[PDB]
Ligand binder design. Structure first.
Ligand SMILES: Cc1cc(S(=O)(=O)c2cc(C(=O)NCc3c(F)ccc4cnn(C5CC5)c34)n(C)c2C)cc2c[nH]nc12
Ligand SMILES: Nc1ncnc2c1ncn2[C@@H]1O[C@H](CSCC[C@H](N)C(=O)O)[C@@H](O)[C@H]1O
Ligand SMILES: [Cl-]
Ligand SMILES: [Cl-]
Ligand SMILES: [Zn+2]
Ligand SMILES: [Zn+2]
Ligand SMILES: [Zn+2]
Length: 428
């Protein structure tokens, strides 16, 4: 859970323990839920929504792209702007801030000017943990109630250099990322340090053991995506009668259509060990697998490979979508934190070159029963006749709502070019 202040601090990167470092930074530690400003990698990963890259050269820079110069601007104005920026950035994401550092010593020295530490406190106006302090009123605020507050209260931090790196920030960042160019500017170092931290913590694999709290429409977004997944995969199996389905990026061996008359094969780069017996370990790349999975259809449900083969059903998240769920990531990618943290490579149109956009439709083979619905996209027995039944018209509108929710949440659907609803009409 917590990082003992007695833990040694590697000074090779600075331009010794955490206890001694807190003294050097100019914080009276007191005699006695805040044993250390610095936190473990594991704790930082749990609070990824709180991550703000921070660097100095004083020119103070943040991973938000903001740079502030202190004498220039006076410190009283600067510290107001910092609390403003952090409050606006984090109020809907986290109960805290985690400064992500590539520590040269100067940034740590500068914290005494805009940071106050002490025991954990609650907001003067709500039940939330205090993130801000007002010298003027001697009161404490959360990110929501910090209007006019001048000090950051009990911020957490990590030095990424303590995760064991040779060379400078730029040499390590540029190994994994070509999107953040290093100018001689503080905010560029702030961005690169957080980018590097995201690479080290999230790019390699999903950690299924770490959950993140609900902060928006996760439940409705996820319900809508699963409803659409069932509809689309059910419809493609009925329409083209594929004998095998290659579910690439399924680490739990759960079928979205369990009643489907098909051989369902599971693959993942990182299968869950309790289901590894049903799942082949496989890293899909088009260059290494373009002549494989030639039989039946491949399902890539948010399995974000470099290029999809022609025989694919695909859901892919657009990393450019602005959302409290969608955090800046590594190499033009984003970190999508919805229940778990999913690093997603940049949305790239060249991935879909073998596919077409999946058009909207509703299909039901279920029994009929009872503002009339006149739509070419309602594929039911009753629409084949004159009027659509009250059941299927209601289910159509619920399905359209789920589809619209999924699109507005940033997900797009792609399908093999031969896919057509002609063959679903045939099933009647
Ligand atoms: C941007 C983006 C989105 C998604 S996602 O939208 O598919 C997604 C997936 C999950 C998730 O928990 N899957 C577990 C799981 C599986 F592994 C396999 C099958 C099922 C069936 N049901 N379930 C769920 C437990 C009920 C399954 N969650 C919470 C989200 C939001 C995955 C990404 C990878 N990179 N980027 C990604
Ligand atoms: N190139 C690749 N080849 C194979 N699996 C990959 C992959 N890139 C990512 N994955 C896997 O894709 C999954 C994405 S998250 C789970 C998605 C799953 N299809 C669902 O419906 O929930 C992870 O399990 C990850 O290990
Ligand atoms: Cl992976
Ligand atoms: Cl983003
Ligand atoms: Zn409050
Ligand atoms: Zn980067
Ligand atoms: Zn009907």
């Amino acid at each position: 859970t917590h990082l003992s202040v007695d833990t040694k601090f590697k000074t090779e990167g600075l331009c010794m323990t955490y206890r001694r470092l807190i003294s050097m930074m100019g914080f009276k530690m007191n005699y006695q839920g805040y044993p250390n400003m610095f936190i473990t990698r594991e704790e930082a990963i749990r609070h990824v929504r709180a991550w703000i890259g921070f660097a100095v050269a004083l020119q103070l820079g943040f991973s938000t792209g903001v740079n502030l110069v202190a004498v220039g601007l006076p410190w009283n104005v600067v510290r107001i702007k910092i609390v403003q920026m952090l409050s606006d950035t984090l109020k809907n994401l986290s109960d805290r801030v985690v400064f992500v550092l590539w520590a040269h010593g100067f940034e740590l020295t500068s914290m005494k000017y805009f940071v106050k530490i002490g025991p954990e406190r609650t907001c003067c106006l709500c039940d939330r943990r205090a993130t801000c302090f007002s010298t003027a009123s001697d009161t404490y605020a959360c990110w929501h109630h910090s209007i006019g507050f001048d000090y950051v209260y009990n911020p957490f931090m990590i030095d990424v250099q303590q995760w064991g790196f040779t060379g400078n920030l730029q040499s390590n960042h540029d190994l994994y990322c070509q999107v953040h160019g290093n100018a001689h500017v503080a905010s560029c170092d702030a961005i690169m340090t957080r980018c590097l931290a995201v690479h080290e913590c999230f790019v390699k694999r999903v950690d299924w053991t770490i959950e993140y709290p609900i902060i928006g429409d996760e439940l409705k977004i996820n319900a809508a995506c699963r409803k659409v997944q069932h509809m689309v995969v059910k419809a493609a199996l009925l329409a083209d009668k594929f004998p095998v389905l290659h579910d690439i990026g399924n680490p739990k061996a759960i079928k979205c259509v369990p009643q489907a008359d098909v051989e369902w094969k599971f693959y993942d780069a990182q299968p869950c060990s309790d289901k590894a017996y049903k799942i082949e370990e496989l890293f899909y790349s088009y260059a290494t697998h373009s002549d494989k999975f030639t039989d039946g259809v491949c399902l890539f449900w948010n399995c974000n490979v470099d290029r999809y083969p022609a025989n694919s059903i695909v859901c892919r998240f657009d990393t450019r979508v602005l959302s409290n769920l969608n955090l800046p990531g590594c190499d033009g990618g984003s970190l999508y934190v919805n229940k778990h943290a999913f690093h997603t490579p940049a949305f790239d149109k060249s991935a879909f070159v073998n596919l077409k956009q999946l058009p909207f439709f509703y299909y039901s083979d279920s029994p009929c029963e009872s503002v009339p619905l006149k739509s070419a996209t309602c594929i039911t027995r009753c629409n084949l006749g004159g009027a659509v039944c009250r059941h299927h018209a209601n289910e159509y509108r619920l399905y359209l709502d789920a589809y619209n929710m999924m699109i507005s949440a940033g997900f797009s659907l792609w399908v093999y070019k031969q896919f057509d609803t002609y063959n679903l009409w045939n099933t009647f």
